[PDB]
C-alpha cells in the first residue's frame, strides 16, 4: 500500500465554527505519519490520553478521528471522562475509555480581534444530557418556567451564546485551540492497517523466511511454477508448503 | 411458479488460497450436492400496477447458489438481512452500469420497487427510476468497486450467457464468489467449470432472510404457469442451497480444478472417494459400516 | 433580536432613594455580564458599576463608592440598581448593556467605554430642588 | 538531594487564572506519590490535592473541589496545577510535596496534615491587587 | 526448578513507624535483568 494523506491541510481550516456543527474527519489507508508531534496537531500540551499511546502502533490502526474545535481557557481541562458542568456535559461529552491525544493552543492572534468576534456560539440550557460524540444543531427556545414558550419573553431563554475575544482579555477568558486525534476501536473493527516492516529478499540461500504470516526456513529459488491469479500459496502432496 | 430441477455439476468452487496440481483432493465444506433439486422463481406481472409479488422471501440457511441466462440486465441486486427494517442493518449488492455500490445500512421501509404499466417493446430505455429507501440511519462501510455483472455481449442467436454466483456468510464474513461463462440452450448445460471467486468483505452481522432486486417496471420473453410443485416453467433464475458434503477435487497440472465427484451420494462415489481416484479397477472394496439407528427412546425408573 | 428595557425615574430630591430595574427577555441572566451606563448631557458616556457572569461580583468606579450598590435576580430575569443619596451633580440618562462571557476586569481591560452588544433606549432621572 | 522547586505565582486578579509547576531535581515522578499544601498567612498548612504513583488516581479538599485541578508530564519529571476561577481568600503560600508510593487515600489512611518525606521551598501567590 | 519453602508473615511493629522506616531500599531501575540467585549492590546513576 503506497499511498500518503496530508495530514496538515485537515487540522487547520479558515474560520472555525460553533459547537453546533464541527467537522469530523475519518482517516484510514494511510502511512501512519504521527512524528508530527511537537509541531502540528499534537504539539504544547501532549496530553495523549490513550492507553499506551505507543502500543497503539502495534494494535494497528483502523480508523482515525481528526477534530478541531475552539474553546475557553477556563475549561481546558474539562476534556477529561468523568467531568460535570453545564459547557462539559451540554456541549460535548466523551466516554469512559477514550483514547487518543487532546491538545490546546494558546490561540491569542487568530482568534481574537480588536472589534471583537462573535462566530462561537455555545448552549447553557436543554433538554437532557446527551449520548457522548452527538451533536445538535436546531435552535428552539425552552421552557423554563411554568409559563408556555411560544413567544419571545421572559422565562423563555434562548440557548445561544456567542462568546466575544479580543488581545485585550485575559489568561482563562482567551480562545484555545483544541485539536484532537482519537484513534479508539468501536468493537475492535480491525479491517485496514498500516505499520509492516518488510526486509529485503535474498535467493539461493538458507535463510529464514516470512510471507503473509506464513514462517519457515530454507531456500528461495525462481522456477517455472504458474499461479493462476486468485493463488498465492503453494502445496502438495502431504500437506508441505 | 415453484418448479423444482435437478442440478447436474454445479457448484463447485476453490475452497482455499493454495496452488495444487495432478492431485486428487478431499475437502469437507459447504458445497451444492450433485443431483439435488433447485427452485425456479418466475416474473410476470409487467403491465399490472400492483406489486408482482415474484420477488419472495427465502431463508438463506448455510449459503446460497445462484445463476442467471440474461442477456439484458434486468437482474440488478441483492437484499440481505435478518429483518430488513428500522431495527437492524441489510446488506445491498446493488449494480449500476460499471460500478458497485455496497452498503451496509439501516433501512426503516421497504415498501414495493417501481412498476411500469407500458410496454418494454415501445419505450426500451431506463432512466432514472429506481427508489427503494427515503431514510438512512446510523451506518458505514459504503463499499464501492468494479461490476460484478461484466456486460458480455451475445449476438447471432443461441449465445446467451450463464452468471453463476454463491454467496456465504462465515463468522461475520461475507463471500461472493462467481463466474461469467457463455453457453447454449440449455437450462442447466450438463459440463463442468471450476467457478472462480470475486470479493471478500468483513460484515459482522447474521443473515436469516434474503431477496433479489429485478427492473421490475417492464419484463419480456418470461413464461409461467399457475401451477406449483413438481412442474416445469421457464424462469431464468436458479437458486440452490448449499451442505456441508464432503468432496473428492481434480487438480489439473496447469493449476485448475478439472472434476470433482461426491462422497455420498452413490455406492461407487464413495469407493472411488477412498481409493482416492477417478479410476477404479474390478473387484470388492470395503467402504465404511453400517448401524441401525434406534427408532426411540425409553426411560423407565422404579415406583 | 434580543432588548432590553429600563424602567424606574422620576423626580428625585437630594438625599432621596431611587431603583432603576432592568429586565432583558431573550438572553439569561448569570450566564450573561450586565453594566450601567451613564452620559450627562454636554459630557461624553461614563460606566456606573458592572456584575460579571460568575456569581455576584460586582465592579464600580471612583466616583461611584459606596453609595450606589448592584444586585442581580435570576428569577424574575431582571438586574438592580439601587440609588442611595443622590448629589445634585447626578443627573443623567442611565443605559443597562449585557456582554456575553465575564467580561468586566478580565485581566488588562476594565469596561472602559461601551463596546457591549446588546443595548436599551435608557430612562432619564433628574434631580433638583 | 531530593528537592522539589516550584515556579510560578505573583500578581492575579479574581476570576484568574495562574499556573504552578514543581520540577523534582531529584527522584522522578511517576513512582513516588506527590501532592500540594497551601499556607493562608496567621494560619496553619493544609493540603489541597494529591496524584498517585500509578495511573492518574486524583483527590481534592471540599472548598476546593471542580474549580483546581492536577496533571502530570513524566517527560519534563514535573507536575502541574491550572488555576481556575480564582476568589480573594486563596492567598497562601503553595508548597510541593513528595513520598514514595501511593500514600493520599491509602485504605483507612487520607493525606491528613503533614506526612510527606520531601519538601519544598515554595511560591507566593496573591490576588486582588 | 525450585526445590525449596516460602516463608512469610506480617511485620507491621518492628519494621515501620509514624515518620517511616527508611531503612529497607528496594532497586527499581537496572540495565539487564538478573540471573538467578544473583545480587547488585553498586550504586551508579540510570539514565533513561
Known amino acids: 500500500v503506497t499511498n500518503l494523506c496530508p495530514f496538515h491541510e485537515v487540522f487547520n481550516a479558515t474560520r472555525f465554527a460553533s459547537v453546533y456543527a464541527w467537522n469530523r474527519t475519518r482517516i484510514s489507508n494511510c502511512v501512519a505519519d504521527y512524528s508530527v508531534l511537537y509541531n502540528f496537531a499534537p504539539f504544547f500540551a501532549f496530553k495523549c490520553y490513550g492507553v499506551s499511546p505507543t502500543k497503539l502502533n502495534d494494535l494497528c490502526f483502523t480508523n482515525v478521528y481528526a477534530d478541531s474545535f475552539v474553546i475557553k481557557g477556563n475549561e481546558v481541562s474539562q476534556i477529561a471522562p468523568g467531568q460535570t458542568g453545564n459547557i462539559a456535559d451540554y456541549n460535548?461529552?466523551?466516554?469512559?475509555?477514550?483514547?487518543?491525544?487532546?491538545?490546546?493552543?494558546?490561540?491569542?492572534?487568530?482568534?481574537?480581534?480588536?472589534?471583537?468576534?462573535?462566530?462561537?456560539?455555545?448552549?447553557?440550557?436543554?433538554?437532557?444530557?446527551?449520548?457522548?460524540?452527538?451533536?445538535?444543531?436546531?435552535?428552539?427556545?425552552?421552557?423554563?418556567?411554568?409559563?408556555p414558550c411560544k413567544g419571545k419573553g421572559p422565562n423563555c431563554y434562548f440557548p445561544l451564546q456567542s462568546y466575544g475575544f479580543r488581545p485585550t482579555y485575559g489568561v482563562g477568558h482567551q480562545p484555545y485551540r483544541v485539536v484532537v486525534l482519537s484513534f479508539e476501536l468501536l468493537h475492535a473493527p480491525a479491517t485496514v492497517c498500516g505499520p509492516k516492516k518488510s526486509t529485503n529478499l535474498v535467493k539461493n540461500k538458507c535463510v529464514n523466511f516470512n510471507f503473509n504470516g506464513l514462517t519457515g526456513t530454507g531456500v528461495l529459488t525462481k522456477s517455472n511454477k504458474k499461479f493462476l491469479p486468485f493463488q498465492q500459496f503453494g502445496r502438495d502432496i502431504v500437506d508441505t508448503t | 411458479?415453484?418448479?423444482?430441477?435437478?442440478?447436474?455439476?454445479?457448484?463447485?468452487?476453490?475452497?482455499?488460497?493454495?496452488?495444487?496440481?495432478?492431485?486428487?483432493?478431499?475437502?469437507?465444506?459447504?458445497?451444492?450436492?450433485?443431483?439435488?433439486?433447485?427452485?425456479?422463481?418466475?416474473?410476470?406481472?409487467?403491465?399490472?400496477?400492483?406489486?408482482?409479488?415474484?420477488?419472495?422471501?427465502?431463508?438463506?440457511?448455510?449459503?446460497?447458489?445462484?445463476?442467471?441466462?440474461?442477456?439484458?440486465?434486468?437482474?440488478?441486486?441483492?437484499?440481505?438481512?435478518?429483518?430488513?427494517?428500522?431495527?437492524?442493518?441489510?446488506?445491498?449488492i446493488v449494480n449500476?452500469?460499471?460500478?458497485?455500490?455496497?452498503?451496509?445500512?439501516?433501512?426503516?421501509?421497504?415498501?414495493?420497487?417501481?412498476?411500469?404499466?407500458?410496454?418494454?417493446?415501445?419505450?426500451?430505455?431506463?432512466?432514472?427510476?429506481?427508489?427503494?429507501?427515503?431514510?438512512?440511519?446510523?451506518?458505514?462501510?459504503?463499499?464501492?468497486?468494479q461490476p460484478f455483472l461484466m456486460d458480455l455481449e451475445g449476438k447471432q442467436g443461441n449465445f446467451k450467457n450463464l452468471?453463476?454466483?454463491?454467496?456465504?456468510?462465515?463468522?461475520?464474513?461475507?463471500?461472493?464468489?462467481?463466474?461469467?461463462?457463455?453457453?447454449?440452450?440449455?437450462?442447466?448445460?450438463?459440463?463442468?467449470?471450476?467457478?472462480?471467486?470475486?470479493?471478500?468483505?468483513?460484515?459482522?452481522?447474521?443473515?436469516?432472510?434474503?431477496?433479489?432486486?429485478?427492473?421490475?417496471?417492464?419484463?419480456?420473453?418470461?413464461?409461467?404457469?399457475?401451477?406449483?410443485?413438481?412442474?416445469?416453467?421457464?424462469?431464468?433464475?436458479?437458486?440452490?442451497?448449499?451442505?456441508?458434503?464432503?468432496?473428492?477435487?481434480?487438480?489439473?497440472?496447469?493449476?485448475?480444478?478439472?472434476?470433482?465427484?461426491?462422497?455420498?451420494?452413490?455406492?461407487?462415489?464413495?469407493?472411488?472417494?477412498?481409493?482416492?481416484?477417478?479410476?477404479?479397477?474390478?473387484?470388492?472394496?470395503?467402504?465404511?459400516?453400517?448401524?441401525?439407528?434406534?427408532?426411540?427412546?425409553?426411560?423407565?425408573?422404579?415406583? | 433580536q434580543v432588548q432590553l428595557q429600563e424602567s424606574g425615574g422620576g423626580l428625585v430630591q437630594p438625599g432621596g432613594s431611587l431603583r432603576l430595574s432592568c429586565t432583558a427577555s431573550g438572553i439569561a441572566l448569570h450566564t450573561h455580564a450586565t453594566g450601567w451606563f451613564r452620559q450627562a448631557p454636554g459630557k461624553e458616556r461614563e460606566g456606573v458599576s458592572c456584575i460579571s457572569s460568575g456569581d455576584g461580583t460586582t465592579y464600580y468606579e471612583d466616583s461611584v463608592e459606596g453609595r450606589f450598590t448592584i444586585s442581580r435576580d435570576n428569577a424574575k430575569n431582571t438586574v438592580y440598581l439601587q440609588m442611595n443619596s443622590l448629589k445634585l451633580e447626578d443627573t443623567a440618562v442611565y443605559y443597562c448593556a449585557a456582554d456575553p462571557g465575564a467580561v468586566c476586569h478580565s485581566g488588562s481591560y476594565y469596561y472602559t467605554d461601551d463596546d457591549f452588544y446588546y443595548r436599551g433606549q435608557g430612562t432619564q432621572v433628574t434631580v433638583s430642588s
Open chain 2, 1 to 92: 411458479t415453484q418448479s423444482y430441477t435437478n442440478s447436474f455439476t454445479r457448484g463447485v468452487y476453490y475452497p482455499d488460497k493454495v496452488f495444487r496440481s495432478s492431485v486428487l483432493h478431499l475437502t469437507q465444506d459447504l458445497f451444492l450436492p450433485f443431483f439435488s433439486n433447485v427452485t425456479w422463481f418466475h416474473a410476470i406481472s409487467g403491465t399490472n400496477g400492483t406489486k408482482r409479488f415474484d420477488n419472495p422471501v427465502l431463508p438463506f440457511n448455510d449459503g446460497v447458489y445462484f445463476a442467471s441466462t440474461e442477456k439484458s440486465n434486468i437482474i440488478r441486486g441483492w437484499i440481505f438481512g435478518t429483518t430488513l427494517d428500522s431495527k437492524t442493518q441489510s446488506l445491498l
Open chain 1, 92 to 147: 460535548y461529552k466523551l466516554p469512559d475509555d477514550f483514547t487518543g491525544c487532546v491538545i490546546a493552543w494558546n490561540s491569542n492572534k487568530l482568534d481574537s480581534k480588536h472589534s471583537g468576534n462573535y462566530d462561537y456560539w455555545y448552549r447553557s440550557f436543554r433538554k437532557s444530557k446527551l449520548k457522548p460524540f452527538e451533536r445538535d444543531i436546531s435552535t428552539e427556545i425552552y421552557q423554563a418556567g411554568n409559563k
Open chain 2, 96 to 145: 449500476n452500469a460499471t460500478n458497485v455500490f455496497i452498503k451496509v445500512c439501516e433501512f426503516q421501509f421497504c415498501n414495493d420497487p417501481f412498476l411500469d404499466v407500458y410496454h418494454k417493446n415501445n419505450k426500451s430505455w431506463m432512466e432514472s427510476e429506481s427508489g427503494v429507501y427515503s431514510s438512512a440511519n446510523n451506518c458505514t462501510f459504503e463499499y464501492v468497486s
Open chain 2, 163 to 303: 452468471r453463476e454466483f454463491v454467496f456465504k456468510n462465515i463468522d461475520g464474513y461475507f463471500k461472493i464468489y462467481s463466474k461469467h461463462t457463455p453457453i447454449i440452450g440449455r437450462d442447466f448445460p450438463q459440463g463442468f467449470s471450476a467457478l472462480e471467486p470475486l470479493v471478500d468483505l468483513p460484515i459482522g452481522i447474521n443473515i436469516t432472510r434474503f431477496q433479489t432486486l429485478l427492473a421490475l417496471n417492464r419484463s419480456y420473453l418470461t413464461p409461467g404457469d399457475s401451477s406449483s410443485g413438481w412442474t416445469a416453467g421457464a424462469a431464468d433464475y436458479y437458486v440452490g442451497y448449499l451442505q456441508p458434503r464432503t468432496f473428492l477435487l481434480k487438480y489439473n497440472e496447469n493449476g485448475t480444478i478439472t472434476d470433482a465427484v461426491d462422497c455420498a451420494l452413490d455406492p461407487l462415489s464413495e469407493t472411488k472417494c477412498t481409493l482416492k481416484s477417478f479410476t477404479v479397477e474390478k473387484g470388492i472394496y470395503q467402504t465404511s459400516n453400517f448401524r441401525v439407528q434406534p427408532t426411540e427412546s425409553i426411560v423407565r425408573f422404579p415406583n
